[PDB]
Design an enzyme around this catalytic site. Structure first.
Site, short mmCIF file in Angstrom:
data_model
loop_
_atom_site.label_atom_id
_atom_site.label_comp_id
_atom_site.label_asym_id
_atom_site.label_seq_id
_atom_site.Cartn_x
_atom_site.Cartn_y
_atom_site.Cartn_z
CG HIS A 67 -0.30 8.19 -6.78
ND1 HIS A 67 -0.51 8.38 -5.28
CD2 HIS A 67 1.22 7.46 -6.83
CE1 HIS A 67 0.40 7.57 -4.48
NE2 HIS A 67 1.08 7.14 -5.36
CG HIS A 90 1.16 -0.19 -9.14
ND1 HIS A 90 2.56 -0.11 -9.41
CD2 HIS A 90 0.79 0.01 -7.83
CE1 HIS A 90 3.15 0.25 -7.98
NE2 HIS A 90 2.27 0.50 -7.25
N1 LIG Z 1 11.68 2.72 -4.44
C1 LIG Z 1 10.81 3.30 -3.86
N2 LIG Z 1 10.53 3.79 -2.70
C2 LIG Z 1 9.43 4.19 -2.05
N3 LIG Z 1 8.32 4.69 -2.88
C3 LIG Z 1 8.27 4.12 -4.05
C4 LIG Z 1 9.58 3.31 -4.64
N4 LIG Z 1 9.25 3.26 -6.03
C5 LIG Z 1 8.02 3.62 -6.37
N5 LIG Z 1 7.31 4.14 -5.03
C6 LIG Z 1 6.03 4.78 -4.88
O1 LIG Z 1 6.16 6.01 -4.70
C7 LIG Z 1 5.04 6.38 -3.82
C8 LIG Z 1 5.55 7.14 -2.52
O2 LIG Z 1 6.25 6.13 -1.97
C9 LIG Z 1 4.29 5.30 -3.88
O3 LIG Z 1 3.23 5.20 -4.82
C10 LIG Z 1 5.14 4.11 -3.93
O4 LIG Z 1 4.58 3.18 -4.60
P1 LIG Z 1 3.64 2.37 -4.16
O5 LIG Z 1 3.48 0.71 -4.74
O6 LIG Z 1 2.07 2.57 -4.68
S1 LIG Z 1 3.33 2.26 -2.35
#
Ligand SMILES: Nc1ncnc2c1ncn2[C@@H]1O[C@H](CO)[C@@H](O)[C@H]1OP(=O)(O)S
Ligand SMILES: [Cl-]
EC number: 3.1.4.37
Length: 209
Positions: free
Chosen positions: A64, A140
Site C-alpha cells: 500500500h 512511497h
Molecule cells: N507517523 C506515523 N506513525 C506510524 N505509521 C505511520 C506514520 N506516518 C505514516 N505511517 C505509515 O502508516 C502505516 C502504518 O503504520 C505504514 O505504512 C507507515 O508507513 P511506512 O513508512 O510504510 S512503515
C-alpha cells in the site's frame, strides 16, 4: 464513529505481487553488485550481505501507499483529514500509481511513488526534510525494513534521498540494472531510477487493523 489506523492506496493482488517481486529481484541484484559490496563498510558497522534477509520485516500481504496516518483519530490532523470531501468521495475508488524508482538504505527498502495532481488532493497537509521538496514527495510503498526500525521511517529515508538528488548529489551511475540506472548516494543509500516507470492499480481506503 472512529477513524481507521490510516488511509492510503491499497494495491491489487496482481500489482502487489508485481511490485514485491521487483523489489525482491532488486535486493538480490544490489547485494550481488560489485559497487554495493565495496561499500558494505558504510552500510553496516559489523564478506557478502543478503539484503532480502537484512530487510526481514516485510509487509505480509497486500502492499500500500499511505496518505495520512490517523491512529484511530489520535494523530494530529486525522479528524480534519477524514472529514474532507475529496477523501470521502475518493473512498473505495480506483487509482493508478506511478513508481519512478526503488531505493535502499541501512534502515528501509521501498519504492518511490509519483502522485498525479488528482492524487495529490488526497495527500495530507500537516517535516524539515520536506523543505524545498514539493508536497507528496514522501509518497512511497515500503518493501521492508531492518529489525529495529519504526514505522514512518521509509518515508523519511525517501525524503533524505530526494534531498541529495535536489542538490545534484546523485552522482554518475555506478552500474546498470535491467530496469535502469543504479546510483550510489553514500551512507548506505542506493537508488534505482527505472527506465520505464511501473504502473500499479490501487484502491483508496482506510485500514482499521
Ligand atoms: N507517523 C506515523 N506513525 C506510524 N505509521 C505511520 C506514520 N506516518 C505514516 N505511517 C505509515 O502508516 C502505516 C502504518 O503504520 C505504514 O505504512 C507507515 O508507513 P511506512 O513508512 O510504510 S512503515
Ligand atoms: Cl511530502
Amino acid at each position: 464513529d472512529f477513524l481507521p489506523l490510516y488511509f492510503g492506496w491499497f494495491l491489487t493482488k496482481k500489482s502487489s505481487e508485481t511490485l514485491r517481486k521487483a523489489g525482491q529481484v532488486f535486493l538480490e541484484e544490489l547485494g550481488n553488485h560489485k559497487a554495493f559490496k565495496k561499500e558494505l563498510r558504510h552500510f553496516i558497522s559489523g564478506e557478502k550481505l543478503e539484503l532480502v534477509s537484512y530487510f526481514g520485516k516485510r509487509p505480509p500481504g497486500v502492499l500500500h501507499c499511505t496518505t495520512k496516518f490517523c491512529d484511530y483519530g489520535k494523530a494530529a490532523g486525522a479528524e480534519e483529514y477524514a472529514q474532507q470531501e475529496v477523501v470521502k468521495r475518493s473512498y473505495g475508488k480506483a487509482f493508478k500509481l506511478s513508481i519512478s524508482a526503488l531505493f535502499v538504505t541501512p534502515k528501509t527498502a521501498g519504492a518511490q511513488v509519483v502522485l498525479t495532481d488528482q492524487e495529490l488532493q488526497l495527500w495530507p497537509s500537516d517535516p524539515s526534510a520536506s523543505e524545498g521538496l514539493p508536497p507528496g514527495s514522501r509518497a512511497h510503498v515500503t518493501l521492508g525494513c531492518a529489525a529495529d526500525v519504526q514505522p514512518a521511517q521509509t518515508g523519511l529515508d525517501l525524503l533524505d534521498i530526494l534531498q541529495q538528488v535536489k542538490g545534484g548529489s546523485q552522482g554518475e551511475a555506478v552500474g546498470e540494472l535491467p530496469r535502469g540506472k543504479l546510483y550510489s548516494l553514500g551512507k548506505g543509500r542506493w537508488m534505482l531510477s527505472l527506465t520505464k516507470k511501473m504502473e500499479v492499480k490501487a484502491i483508496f481506503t482506510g485500514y482499521y487493523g
